[PDB]
């Protein structure tokens, strides 16, 4: 019930996606995510848990932009 | 040399370094045998010893980018250097002269070395110019040189290994420009077109003066594919154990 | 209680940098094709996959949340379970389909370098989502002579956070490649 | 051809020595409380004892090249074998000795030191060391089997495919540590939750003391610095069978492309093999020195730095190949801040050491010449992360006589400091220390004059990777020297097996076992701790035993022998890849079809 309210949010985001198309189109794609992976992290085991995804994605954008950035 | 003065200068940098942990061992330790304060106040060295040479460094980063240890802003000399297995190749675009695996230059002239290499990734080292950057196959870097003064400047390539790697060694001279002018040409042999495909062959090899420039084939700074057109084209792809001595198929120019 | 949950998790966050290398390499092999075929690939079925694989997600939220810790639907996990699993072979064989014509010019990783990439960024891509039906197929074995209970068969989460991690970089990829 | 005709021989005595004299019958010793065992006591020592075959075959290759570079032109190895013994000696080490030694330092002393009982997966973790010794006879089978590689353990791309030439050659090194990457993997997984969430009662995070800290860094980088090695040598992998065109020259591939992966993974990785080496240094000297480790808010803070830190300064191997300026000086910047947070960790040893008492033993003499050795190495990779000035001393022996007095003292002495250290664990005694102090000197002496005459050998103009220098302006001596020392090296090891032959004033959870080679269970009673050191605090401090009556179940983790199975389908998969079978492979896809019928046991095992 509370888990259709973001499914059905997280359809516009793609849609909106080849509308860009067809940074402005870097940070839909990170959000379009944010939402699907909030609703199943916390807690208990949490923390260590979003946490570690957290300086994984840096390390993400350390790789990406790095080997770009020669 | 320009970096020279950096080694030097850190030696002695690091040299204390090195005589500092003596005094923090051997005055004590002797002297106690059975027969938050001072942590914090530490953080203000340690970046003094590296922004010392964090602004230096940097300064000198920026310095062998433009015009560098040679012309101020005159005498552009262009040199295409290309890099054959085990061989060095050295082509001039201002006169139609091209030489492999020898090299001569004038004193305070600069040479804007365009870099490359066909076979294997490698670069020219020549220690006694200093600074040396990647030969890339499949682009060209550019690359900035002087000679200080007259001399035989011993030249090498970084040696990624890769069996006739160690005797790469083109030994360069350096003489004056009046007898450069009379040596841009001994007397611009020619390019043969096959011959420069009898190159790309990893063997050992002589002078070859060669008084023609080849640049007018596929610029070999680009389009590195050049290495199929030349070992195959000849019939040669070698192997570990036996049935090598490039798999049958002669015409070359070898030693002895 | 199960620590698979956390440490079947970090190897998620593993994957993150598994991904990004590949990401890495195919961002700086994108200006490449100075020989060969260049890159024209239809729009609709990059639609067609990702809004496929949208809804997949869209029926695995609700799938264990409205499932078991919300009422114990202990019937349904042979109905939201299969469902979800035959969406994945919707993603498998509209990939295969699509590299079957791509072998009409730019076939496999021979025939450019930045197909290779292409082929690799979605090859293990494709390899994940394809054994994980097979990790999905192989919990389902369980209501038979097992048949646990939630906050017990762990089996369940662990295999179904791990298909929800593919859905990350599948968007990624949507905005990565297209 | 001549030398290799011998070892085959004795490759397949060895092999034959086995089935007479051990194979008497060892379906119940052998395939029961070893090779697919649980315990993680027994793990560990399976590790180590595979980094010392390794120290032997990675010996004769150290010995034999600087033997054949002792002057010029001598003829004891040819291009071709110069070649592939220099890249099989530094791929032996890093990946199968100081990885195996100090995860095997790892796999035994972390887990008693938190007072869990096994790890947090002790089912993955023993497929974790087959993945690692499948890969490690894959490496090994290279000698005459087929073909050793010969492109260096970097092996970059140019100088690997065709331009190469061995087939069985360079996919050895890519089906090799690929498998072992699979198991190092796990083994970060596994120890990263086994000290996250298998505590005992009283262990605080803060204070667990500080060589578990470095075992969590450990586990960290090796969680996001080796799915980079996967895909990495996967790329590789492709170009070299499956016929892909990553970093090919001819359709155009980027050459250097490889490099970056391969150093994105390589100089977190390098920390991985150093991290370790400091903690296993941080109790040794903080436990006979009877102080207390003085600094937290500072010395785990500042392990926290190098672990995030170790992924912005990767790009300093390369800054020869013409980058961007700009990012050639922000990884020498950078690069200059990393010898700040691991700088900060040697002023915290010797303020431990003063004030308080001491007593030279054996274990104490590798901590003692651990400091400078690894600063005198230290001092000159400062001068390696100056951008400005590394053109001129790239590769050039100056490069390779910094990292050989940064790991060896680093690495390879905590790998002979945890040795004797923690061997009463392993069995009954200890090694005797009047004459292990013989194995310390003549080690050490021979060090410093094998690799400090490189400095002179490297800045005079005697570059890396060369079978023979030539009268150049007297050299000669500098290069033989350094054979001197590094043949005075070799002369120990017989000490060192020698030592082994022969069959404390602890602070933390060391000897508070129950006796000597502590049982399976370990420990009957969590300990309370509730302190920084445990082990002082329960001595003079009241006392605090294991009384009877409060004891209790067991765990019941038994053995499955799965993971030998599951590993020998990756050895086998990626010895059939390897030898010959270019394009695809008959025996290679039937390693993955047996690992993914034995993936589907491992959730159709109830335990
Ligand atoms: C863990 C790191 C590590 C360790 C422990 C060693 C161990 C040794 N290494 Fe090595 N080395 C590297 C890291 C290491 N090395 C790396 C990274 C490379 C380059 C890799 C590449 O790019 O390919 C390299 C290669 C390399 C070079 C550079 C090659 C070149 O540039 O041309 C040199 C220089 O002399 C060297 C020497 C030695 C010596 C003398 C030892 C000593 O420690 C030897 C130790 C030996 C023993 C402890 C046992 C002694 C053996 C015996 C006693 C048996 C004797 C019996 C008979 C001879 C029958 N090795
Ligand atoms: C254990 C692994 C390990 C560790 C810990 C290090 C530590 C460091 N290394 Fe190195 N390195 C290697 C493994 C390692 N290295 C290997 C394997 C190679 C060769 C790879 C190959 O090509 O095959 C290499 C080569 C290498 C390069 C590449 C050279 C090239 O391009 O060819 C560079 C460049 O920056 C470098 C620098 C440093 C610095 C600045 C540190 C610092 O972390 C060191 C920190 C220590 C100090 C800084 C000194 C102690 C500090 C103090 C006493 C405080 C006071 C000092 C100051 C204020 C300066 N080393
Ligand atoms: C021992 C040994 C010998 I003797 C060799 O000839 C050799 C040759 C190539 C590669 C590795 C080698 N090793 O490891
Ligand atoms: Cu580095």
């Known amino acids: 019930x509370x888990x259709x309210x973001x499914x059905x949010x997280x359809x516009x985001x793609x849609x909106x996606x080849x509308x860009x198309x067809x940074f402005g189109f870097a940070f839909i794609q990170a959000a379009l995510q944010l939402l699907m992976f909030m609703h199943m992290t916390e807690s208990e085991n949490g923390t260590i848990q979003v946490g570690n995804t957290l300086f994984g994605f840096f390390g993400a954008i350390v790789i990406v932009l790095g080997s770009i950035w020669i | 040399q320009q970096s020279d003065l950096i080694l030097l200068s850190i030696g002695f940098m690091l040299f204390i370094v090195g005589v500092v942990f003596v005094l923090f061992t051997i005055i004590l330790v002797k002297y106690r045998d059975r027969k938050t304060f001072l942590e914090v106040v530490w953080t203000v060295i340690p970046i003094l010893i590296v922004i010392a040479l964090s602004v230096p460094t940097v300064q000198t980063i920026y310095s062998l980018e433009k015009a560098p240890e040679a012309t101020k802003d005159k005498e552009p000399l262009v040199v295409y250097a290309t890099s054959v297995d085990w061989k060095w190749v050295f082509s001039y675009p201002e006169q139609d002269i091209e030489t492999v695996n020898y090299l001569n230059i004038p004193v305070d002239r600069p040479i804007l070395f365009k870099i490359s290499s066909a076979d294997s990734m490698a670069s020219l080292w020549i220690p006694q110019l200093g600074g040396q950057k990647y030969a890339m196959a499949g682009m060209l870097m550019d690359q900035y040189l002087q000679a200080d003064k007259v001399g035989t400047y011993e030249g090498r390539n970084a040696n990624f290994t890769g069996e006739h790697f160690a005797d790469q060694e083109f030994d360069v001279n350096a003489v004056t420009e009046k007898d450069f002018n009379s040596w841009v040409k001994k007397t611009q042999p020619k390019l043969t077109k096959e011959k420069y495909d009898e190159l790309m062959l990893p063997e050992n090899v002589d002078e070859l003066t060669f008084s023609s420039t080849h640049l007018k084939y596929v610029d070999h700074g680009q389009d590195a594919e050049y290495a199929m057109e030349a070992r195959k084209r000849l019939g040669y792809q070698a192997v570990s154990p036996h049935s090598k001595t490039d798999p049958f198929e002669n015409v070359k120019k070898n030693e002895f | 209680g199960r620590l698979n949950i956390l440490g079947f998790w970090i190897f998620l966050g593993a994957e993150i940098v598994l991904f990004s290398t590949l990401f890495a390499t195919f961002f700086v092999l994108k200006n490449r094709t100075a020989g060969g075929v260049l890159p024209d690939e239809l729009f609709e079925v990059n639609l067609v996959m990702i809004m496929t694989f949208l809804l997949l997600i869209s029926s695995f939220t609700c799938g264990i949340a409205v499932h078991e810790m919300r009422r114990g639907s202990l019937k349904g996990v042979v109905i939201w379970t299969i469902i979800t699993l035959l969406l994945g072979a919707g993603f498998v064989g509209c990939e295969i389909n699509e590299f079957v014509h791509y072998v009409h010019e730019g076939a496999a990783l021979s025939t450019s370098a930045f197909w290779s990439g292409f082929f690799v960024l979605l090859g293990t891509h494709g390899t994940h989502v394809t054994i994980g039906i097979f990790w999905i197929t192989g919990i389902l074995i369980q209501l038979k002579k097992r048949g646990l209970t939630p906050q017990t068969s762990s089996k369940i989460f662990i295999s179904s956070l791990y298909w929800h991690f593919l859905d990350v970089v599948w968007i990624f990829i949507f905005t990565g490649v297209y | 051809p001549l030398i290799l005709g011998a070892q085959v021989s004795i490759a397949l005595s060895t092999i034959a020595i086995i089935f007479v004299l051990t194979y008497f019958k060892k379906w119940k010793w052998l395939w029961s409380e070893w090779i697919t065992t649980v315990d993680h ?17 990675g010996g004769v290759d150290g010995l034999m090249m600087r033997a054949q570079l002792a002057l010029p032109n001598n003829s004891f190895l040819d291009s071709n074998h110069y070649n592939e013994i220099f890249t ?9 000795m100081a990885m195996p030694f100090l995860i095997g330092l790892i796999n035994v002393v972390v887990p008693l030191q938190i007072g869990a009982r096994d790890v947090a997966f002790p089912y993955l973790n023993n497929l974790s060391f087959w993945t690692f010794f499948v890969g490690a006879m894959l490496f090994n089978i290279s000698f005459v089997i087929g073909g050793s590689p010969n492109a260096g353990w970097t092996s970059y791309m140019p100088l690997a495919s065709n331009d190469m030439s061995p087939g069985p050659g360079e996919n050895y090194y890519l089906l090799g540590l690929q498998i072992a990457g699979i198991g190092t993997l796990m083994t970060g997984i596994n120890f990263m939750v086994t000290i996250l969430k298998m505590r005992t009662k009283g262990m605080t995070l803060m204070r667990m003391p500080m060589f578990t800290w470095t075992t969590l860094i450990t586990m960290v980088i090796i969680v996001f ?11 590789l992998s492709f170009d070299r069978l499956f016929g892909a065109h990553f970093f090919t020259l001819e359709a155009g591939g980027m050459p250097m492309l490889w490099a970056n992966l391969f150093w994105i993974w390589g100089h977190p990785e390098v920390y991985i093999v150093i991290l370790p080496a400091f903690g296993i240094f941080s109790e040794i000297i903080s436990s006979f020195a009877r102080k207390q480790l003085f600094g937290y808010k500072a010395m785990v803070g500042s392990i926290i730095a190098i672990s995030v830190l170790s992924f912005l300064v990767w790009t300093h191997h390369f800054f020869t190949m013409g980058n961007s300026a700009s990012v050639n000086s922000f990884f020498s910047i950078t690069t200059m801040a990393i010898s700040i947070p691991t700088g900060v960790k040697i002023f915290n040893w010797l303020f431990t050491m003063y004030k308080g008492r001491i007593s030279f033993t054996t274990p104490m003499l590798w901590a003692l010449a651990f400091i400078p050795n690894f600063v005198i190495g230290g001092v000159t990779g400062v001068m390696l992360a100056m951008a400005a000035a590394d053109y001129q001393y790239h590769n050039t022996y100056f490069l390779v006589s910094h990292f050989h007095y940064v790991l060896i003292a680093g690495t390879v002495f905590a790998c002979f400091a945890g040795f004797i250290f923690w061997y009463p664990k392993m069995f009954g005694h200890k090694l005797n220390e009047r004459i292990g102090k013989w194995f310390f000197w003549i080690f050490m002496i021979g060090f410093n004059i094998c690799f400090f005459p490189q400095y002179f050998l490297g800045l005079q103009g005697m570059p890396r990777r060369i079978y023979t220098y030539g009268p150049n302006d007297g050299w000669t001596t500098l290069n033989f020297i350094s054979t001197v020392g590094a043949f005075m090296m070799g002369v120990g ?40 050191d445990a082990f002082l605090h329960m001595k003079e401090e009241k006392t605090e035993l294991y009384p009877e009556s409060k004891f209790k179940k067991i765990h019941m983790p038994s053995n499955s022998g799965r993971p030998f199975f599951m590993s020998v389908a990756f050895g086998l998969a990626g010895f059939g890849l390897v030898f010959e079978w270019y394009w695809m492979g008959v025996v290679g896809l039937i390693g993955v079809l047996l690992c993914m019928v034995l993936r589907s046991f491992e959730y159709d095992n109830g335990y």
């Open chain 4, 41 to 57: 006591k027994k793990l560990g020592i399976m590790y180590i004892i595979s980094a010392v075959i390794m120290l032997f075959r």
């Open chain 4, 88 to 96: 099989t000696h530094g791929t032996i080490m890093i990946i199968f």
């Open chain 4, 225 to 235: 610095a080796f799915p980079v090695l996967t895909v990495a040598l996967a790329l």
């Open chain 4, 493 to 532: 090891f017989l000490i060192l097996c020698y030592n082994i032959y022969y069959s404390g004033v602890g602070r933390t959870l060391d000897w508070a076992t129950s006796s000597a080679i502590p049982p399976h269970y370990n420990f009957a009673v969590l300990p309370e701790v509730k302190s920084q």
